[PDB]
């Protein structure tokens, strides 16, 4: 129950060299429950 709001900000967070401070977690062992945050850093066990 709620709403989502989004607006484009190409004019404020782009920079010509590309902005690299933005991050996300692509590799993760388990799916998080709703309303959770994961700021820890650990090496991904991709293989054996």
């Amino acid at each position, epitope marked *: 129950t709620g709403c989502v709001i989004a*607006w*484009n900000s*190409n*004019k404020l967070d782009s920079k*010509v060299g590309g902005n690299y401070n933005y991050r996300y977690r692509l590799f993760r062992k388990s799916n998080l429950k709703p309303f959770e945050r994961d700021i820890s850093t650990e090496i991904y066990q991709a293989g054996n």
Partner: nanobody
Amino acid sequence: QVQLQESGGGLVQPGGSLRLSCTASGIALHTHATGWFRQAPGKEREGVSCISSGDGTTYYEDSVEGRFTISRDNAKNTVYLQMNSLKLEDTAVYYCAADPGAVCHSGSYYYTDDDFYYRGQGTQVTVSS
């Protein structure tokens, strides 16, 4: 009978900064696309920058990248062009213009083709020592 009025310009030292302003009397912003054009003596007129209608992606020319900025204030209905790091070659007159719809770079078109409906008187910007 809509007028577009410009303010700014004058004698500025190279390496200085200026803020040109264009204000629309009849029409309102955030509905048109607003561009700046520049004409030099003995040369043909060339654009400077453009903002489209909705939100407005800022488009710049090849010779003005990284130095000139553009912004649009809908509270005062005024578009602002920020001159930073001026060289010697831009001693010329500037005009502001508007066109209905998002016209700047939608497909294989670009605002170098001067076909805007609303025009302005223009202001003179001069760099000298």
